[PDB]
Amino acid sequence: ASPFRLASAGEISEVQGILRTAGLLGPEKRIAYLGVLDPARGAGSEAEDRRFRVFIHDVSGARPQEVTVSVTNGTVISAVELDTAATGELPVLEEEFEVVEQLLATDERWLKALAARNLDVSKVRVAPLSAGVFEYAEERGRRILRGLAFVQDFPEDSAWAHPVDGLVAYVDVVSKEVTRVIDTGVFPVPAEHGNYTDPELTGPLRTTQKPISITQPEGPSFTVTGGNHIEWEKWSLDVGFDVREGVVLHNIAFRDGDRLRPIINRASIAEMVVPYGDPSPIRSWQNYFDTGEYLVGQYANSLELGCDCLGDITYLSPVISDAFGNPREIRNGICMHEEDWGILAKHSDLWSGINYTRRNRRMVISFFTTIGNYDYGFYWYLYLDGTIEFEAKATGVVFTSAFPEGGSDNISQLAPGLGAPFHQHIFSARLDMAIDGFTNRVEEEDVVRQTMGPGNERGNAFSRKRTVLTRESEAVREADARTGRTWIISNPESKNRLNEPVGYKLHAHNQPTLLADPGSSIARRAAFATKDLWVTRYADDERYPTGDFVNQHSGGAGLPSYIAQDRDIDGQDIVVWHTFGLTHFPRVEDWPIMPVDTVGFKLRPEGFFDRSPVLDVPAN
Amino acid sequence: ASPFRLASAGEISEVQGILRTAGLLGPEKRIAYLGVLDPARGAGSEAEDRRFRVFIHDVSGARPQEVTVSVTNGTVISAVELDTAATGELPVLEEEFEVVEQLLATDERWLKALAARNLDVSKVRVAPLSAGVFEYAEERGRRILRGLAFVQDFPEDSAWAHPVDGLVAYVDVVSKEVTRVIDTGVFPVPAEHGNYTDPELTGPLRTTQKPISITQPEGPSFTVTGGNHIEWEKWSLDVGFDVREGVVLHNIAFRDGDRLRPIINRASIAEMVVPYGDPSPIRSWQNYFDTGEYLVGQYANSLELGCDCLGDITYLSPVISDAFGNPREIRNGICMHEEDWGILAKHSDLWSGINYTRRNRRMVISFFTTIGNYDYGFYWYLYLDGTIEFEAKATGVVFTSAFPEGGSDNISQLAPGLGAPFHQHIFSARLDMAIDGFTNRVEEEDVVRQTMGPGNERGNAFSRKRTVLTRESEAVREADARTGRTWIISNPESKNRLNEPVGYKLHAHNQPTLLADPGSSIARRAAFATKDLWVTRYADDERYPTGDFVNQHSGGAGLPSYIAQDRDIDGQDIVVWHTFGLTHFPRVEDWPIMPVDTVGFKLRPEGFFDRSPVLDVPAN
Ligand SMILES: [NH3+]CCc1ccccc1
Ligand SMILES: [NH3+]CCc1ccccc1
Ligand SMILES: [Cu+2]
Ligand SMILES: [Cu+2]
Ligand code: NA
Ligand code: NA
């Protein structure tokens, strides 16, 4: 019944039929993105209209199309031809992964490069990497992937241990031409394997770990209704899933007494970018937007009980479309469970004699995705006390190169002859805020140091200052860890019992933002990543910080174009965009498979409640 | 057998006998600190000499003494009279907590103040607060506590809800005189109660929480031998306990193959300070060093199975001395257990077809302490992958005041008429480093941004730079979150298989340091808290960042005096001192009992191992 329900296999089948009948799904068509559209602002009509957005690619070289379809009215709403030289290429297709290796395998320039290195072409894997936009005029308007080669010694070998450096090729995947092959020199292919399941490398496995059993004998404390609506410990929300963004959280609310109070209308990771800091011409073009270019949701793993998710697990199995419009289930793609989280509140009072201890817990909603060498877990946490937290968990295999004789300022050595270029992993969280309703504002809060003197005679005073962001042109903010800078999202029309505006405080990790030179191509295409915090006025079509078509777009789309409208954001329907990321100087311990590292952010209530919201928690 | 074993009740009894026989424990004596001394550098003699350090107070007004005693030779090693006007007062005694209220209860100035407010003296609780050093010349050389009053309406009432503002008294607890009573005006005593176990306030308790059962059917994976030696998942260490510092970790090492490799020789929280930022004369003197002035270990809680520590728990029950030299057990004062910690490493490889997932876990060693209104949990974590992490958990009841009519720049309103002054909680971790041995050095690592140009034609390069700290005068460092600043502790004489020095990287949270004016009394007494990182050359007597006698010391002792020696720290026996803390602007949700907030730091291996140290972990 809910307009926020997951897409069903039946809905996907109808979309395919509607497209087919209208002539838009010929044998040369490929669906490059399919996703349900959110209800527009003003759903108080209950006139449910399930609409879907589709990007249609053409393998014969015709112009792609963007198409909106109503499964509720069996109609094509709109269908527009796209000029990709203008607005960007469509996301990479999964079936294009192997096309790069196959086209290179018959190219004479490629075979001469491999032969000079004594490499058997049947052993050489080619990574299908997004191309970006650089100096090559012949690439404008064409669908280009770039290829870097790795050697597999045998079918189960980890190819990442054997990069073929000094060699890169560019490929046009529509016309099937190899446009350039660049060979800058021969590097020894690193010889050690990185097979982390080989007993030769692992040694004897440990026998010292004894099992930890986590069970819920009466089942979990949360309920799931309508397929994806969650209620847990006064929290209410809908769990959505989009093939581009992955897990999306809708309608986050908290039941404060008899009142259901909204907090966040929509929460997602709307983009992520991995820029590499190696100036070698072999890799200096390398940046991928896993979300915008590859679509992280379509590579979600099936999560195994006991290994990936431990405890009393409830699974969701989202449905997406394959390239031909058929539905495919991602079995067990989303794990949901509650976890004990230590002490929530504790006090032993000397004067009253009362000893008080309560335990905390959190609700976990998570998925894992794999794009090539990288694996990422996305975790949303809801805590008893009103805190919301996101955590990214980065693991998988680092992207490798040769380690140059005589070292490098931009590459780490992981093993003899084997290097790992410096890079970042940068995320954009899009938080469509709804603190007690849609009239919200953002204040920047800094600690204020005070000078010893009149009114502060012992020099101990300190304070804080809050600056309201009133227009989009002043809502592009940087972190300042030294002044304890945070941002408060408040509702000036909703007050707590002290007559102060209710609010939530955003706590950032204050990691470095984009390191690239501001005049670089990546700084223009990933402009969102140059600042920690952006606030925009809500608008239906402003979904991604990089725009709708990230692949090979020349830059500027998204956030910098949105905020130039300079709209009013002081007590309006606003969206907060938080940039956060990891700067990764690879270490020896990251090899041959990387232990998880983490980054994220959290939001805590700031005078949202009239007192602690966990006074009614019982004693275990 | 181990020289690092916990003190036994029998050892305490011998100390008391030795002191008594030597004439040092007369009926006017009080033991204000008793603790075992660490073995000196050069324990390779195995000549165990269990020595204890004792601070002896005299309630009749004689000079206190510092005494060292060998329980191994039944001898007083040394006994020195202390000039407290010079070197500071002894730590607050527990029996002095009630003396402040009792002395005030018969003072005419105090009774006139209470009578003007219609307060029954039998309802008025007085907090025994450390005095610091300010402008009062009469206080030099005397043992002073200051008193702030709270009203208890009935024996089980939370007094913190009813501060008596505009009133403070200073008391000499040795001569039992009230030296001053300051009344700056009448404030209404806030009327609402803060009784968080009152059904009137909590409402009906939740019935929606279902149990989480954590068990280990074959017992825990770690072993405890010799009372306090832990082995777990290649980690080895001794858990110590000191009445001042609390849990202390000794001899942290990791078994890498057949080799036991040291990492940290001694880890402790060596000081913590809570400065208040309210310039009102009633509170502008308020700073307490919970560790140095009050001794956090002697207020450790007895931790309850199921409430405080959940899972398969192993307890340690440390023994300390009471004020008369009798041993007292802190039953169940330290909890130890292992916890599941999610995914450790994961990759699904497109080319080899191998799907790989391993789970992480951590070893937890924790205690909780209560000093007045505040409750703090101290947690040490050891992870499978070599990471060491500390976390402080702050809860309890916020310190309160009246909320002034017309507001305040330095106080938060929590309830009608009830305020909570701004303050910080700042910790000092003392890490006596032993990375693969005692020859260590510290490098500061900053990210380096590079300009687009020759050698960096696409403007994507970035790098990092490391600066060796060679002398103590240059080893006082500040954080810089914007440049991703970290510190690496390495051993230049111990290399990994890549011929690079083995190391560990310290990751700070980069929270604000001490906010007080640098010319303030607190900035002089808590000088350590003004900078994020200090490195000193190890020396036996350099134990605390504030010196041995914090109470009423005039400032400068500790770290600023140590580093003026300007000793060589480049490949030497060094000690890292990390300042970290929380800046607390109290929120409504902190009232009437505060949900836990956290701060801490972590150390991760940086080329310490020759590859990931968790390749031998098995598949669940
Ligand atoms: N993460 C997207 C880049 C990528 C895609 C496929 C293989 C290796 C790398
Ligand atoms: N934390 C040390 C200060 C303190 C001590 C006792 C009661 C209230 C406050
Ligand atoms: Cu990385
Ligand atoms: Cu606090
Ligand atoms: Na909004
Ligand atoms: Na050392």
PDB file of N, CA and C in Angstrom, chain B residues 34-61:
ATOM      1  N   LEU B  34      48.720   4.715  47.920  1.00  0.00           N
ATOM      2  CA  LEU B  34      49.610   3.570  48.018  1.00  0.00           C
ATOM      3  C   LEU B  34      49.618   2.856  46.681  1.00  0.00           C
ATOM      4  N   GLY B  35      50.807   2.537  46.164  1.00  0.00           N
ATOM      5  CA  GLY B  35      50.896   1.858  44.884  1.00  0.00           C
ATOM      6  C   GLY B  35      52.233   1.185  44.690  1.00  0.00           C
ATOM      7  N   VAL B  36      52.223   0.102  43.914  1.00  0.00           N
ATOM      8  CA  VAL B  36      53.435  -0.650  43.606  1.00  0.00           C
ATOM      9  C   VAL B  36      54.258   0.107  42.565  1.00  0.00           C
ATOM     10  N   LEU B  37      55.579   0.051  42.696  1.00  0.00           N
ATOM     11  CA  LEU B  37      56.459   0.698  41.732  1.00  0.00           C
ATOM     12  C   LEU B  37      56.804  -0.282  40.616  1.00  0.00           C
ATOM     13  N   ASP B  38      56.907   0.227  39.391  1.00  0.00           N
ATOM     14  CA  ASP B  38      57.298  -0.638  38.294  1.00  0.00           C
ATOM     15  C   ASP B  38      58.765  -1.044  38.442  1.00  0.00           C
ATOM     16  N   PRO B  39      59.124  -2.235  37.965  1.00  0.00           N
ATOM     17  CA  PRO B  39      60.541  -2.623  37.910  1.00  0.00           C
ATOM     18  C   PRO B  39      61.351  -1.605  37.123  1.00  0.00           C
ATOM     19  N   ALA B  40      62.566  -1.338  37.596  1.00  0.00           N
ATOM     20  CA  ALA B  40      63.429  -0.380  36.923  1.00  0.00           C
ATOM     21  C   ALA B  40      63.955  -0.963  35.612  1.00  0.00           C
ATOM     22  N   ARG B  41      64.476  -0.081  34.760  1.00  0.00           N
ATOM     23  CA  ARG B  41      64.996  -0.510  33.466  1.00  0.00           C
ATOM     24  C   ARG B  41      66.239  -1.365  33.679  1.00  0.00           C
ATOM     25  N   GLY B  42      66.150  -2.640  33.308  1.00  0.00           N
ATOM     26  CA  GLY B  42      67.201  -3.588  33.615  1.00  0.00           C
ATOM     27  C   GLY B  42      66.716  -4.664  34.565  1.00  0.00           C
ATOM     28  N   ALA B  43      65.539  -5.217  34.274  1.00  0.00           N
ATOM     29  CA  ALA B  43      64.971  -6.314  35.044  1.00  0.00           C
ATOM     30  C   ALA B  43      65.592  -7.661  34.705  1.00  0.00           C
ATOM     31  N   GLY B  44      66.659  -7.683  33.909  1.00  0.00           N
ATOM     32  CA  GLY B  44      67.272  -8.931  33.503  1.00  0.00           C
ATOM     33  C   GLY B  44      68.142  -9.531  34.587  1.00  0.00           C
ATOM     34  N   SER B  45      67.996  -9.028  35.814  1.00  0.00           N
ATOM     35  CA  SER B  45      68.650  -9.627  36.969  1.00  0.00           C
ATOM     36  C   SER B  45      67.757 -10.628  37.690  1.00  0.00           C
ATOM     37  N   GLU B  46      66.440 -10.559  37.470  1.00  0.00           N
ATOM     38  CA  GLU B  46      65.449 -11.431  38.100  1.00  0.00           C
ATOM     39  C   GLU B  46      65.423 -11.287  39.618  1.00  0.00           C
ATOM     40  N   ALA B  47      66.240 -10.387  40.165  1.00  0.00           N
ATOM     41  CA  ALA B  47      66.210 -10.085  41.594  1.00  0.00           C
ATOM     42  C   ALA B  47      64.963  -9.248  41.860  1.00  0.00           C
ATOM     43  N   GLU B  48      63.832  -9.943  41.987  1.00  0.00           N
ATOM     44  CA  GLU B  48      62.560  -9.283  42.249  1.00  0.00           C
ATOM     45  C   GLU B  48      62.627  -8.483  43.543  1.00  0.00           C
ATOM     46  N   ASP B  49      62.289  -7.199  43.460  1.00  0.00           N
ATOM     47  CA  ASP B  49      62.199  -6.339  44.636  1.00  0.00           C
ATOM     48  C   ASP B  49      60.873  -5.589  44.552  1.00  0.00           C
ATOM     49  N   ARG B  50      59.855  -6.115  45.227  1.00  0.00           N
ATOM     50  CA  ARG B  50      58.539  -5.492  45.236  1.00  0.00           C
ATOM     51  C   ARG B  50      58.560  -4.259  46.132  1.00  0.00           C
ATOM     52  N   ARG B  51      58.542  -3.075  45.517  1.00  0.00           N
ATOM     53  CA  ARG B  51      58.575  -1.804  46.226  1.00  0.00           C
ATOM     54  C   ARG B  51      57.245  -1.075  46.093  1.00  0.00           C
ATOM     55  N   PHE B  52      56.909  -0.312  47.125  1.00  0.00           N
ATOM     56  CA  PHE B  52      55.671   0.442  47.156  1.00  0.00           C
ATOM     57  C   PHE B  52      55.982   1.888  47.503  1.00  0.00           C
ATOM     58  N   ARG B  53      55.198   2.784  46.918  1.00  0.00           N
ATOM     59  CA  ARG B  53      55.248   4.215  47.172  1.00  0.00           C
ATOM     60  C   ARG B  53      54.021   4.593  47.984  1.00  0.00           C
ATOM     61  N   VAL B  54      54.218   5.385  49.041  1.00  0.00           N
ATOM     62  CA  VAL B  54      53.143   5.770  49.950  1.00  0.00           C
ATOM     63  C   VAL B  54      53.208   7.276  50.174  1.00  0.00           C
ATOM     64  N   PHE B  55      52.049   7.945  50.102  1.00  0.00           N
ATOM     65  CA  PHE B  55      51.895   9.327  50.546  1.00  0.00           C
ATOM     66  C   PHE B  55      51.163   9.299  51.884  1.00  0.00           C
ATOM     67  N   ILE B  56      51.765   9.886  52.920  1.00  0.00           N
ATOM     68  CA  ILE B  56      51.205   9.854  54.271  1.00  0.00           C
ATOM     69  C   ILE B  56      50.809  11.260  54.685  1.00  0.00           C
ATOM     70  N   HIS B  57      49.529  11.436  54.975  1.00  0.00           N
ATOM     71  CA  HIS B  57      48.947  12.682  55.436  1.00  0.00           C
ATOM     72  C   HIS B  57      48.867  12.663  56.960  1.00  0.00           C
ATOM     73  N   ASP B  58      48.853  13.854  57.554  1.00  0.00           N
ATOM     74  CA  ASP B  58      48.775  14.016  59.007  1.00  0.00           C
ATOM     75  C   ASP B  58      47.614  14.937  59.334  1.00  0.00           C
ATOM     76  N   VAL B  59      46.606  14.408  60.038  1.00  0.00           N
ATOM     77  CA  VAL B  59      45.387  15.175  60.296  1.00  0.00           C
ATOM     78  C   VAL B  59      45.558  16.189  61.411  1.00  0.00           C
ATOM     79  N   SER B  60      46.656  16.113  62.157  1.00  0.00           N
ATOM     80  CA  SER B  60      46.963  17.056  63.221  1.00  0.00           C
ATOM     81  C   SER B  60      47.707  18.289  62.729  1.00  0.00           C
ATOM     82  N   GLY B  61      48.143  18.310  61.473  1.00  0.00           N
ATOM     83  CA  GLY B  61      48.825  19.462  60.927  1.00  0.00           C
ATOM     84  C   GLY B  61      50.323  19.318  60.768  1.00  0.00           C
TER      85      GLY B  61
END
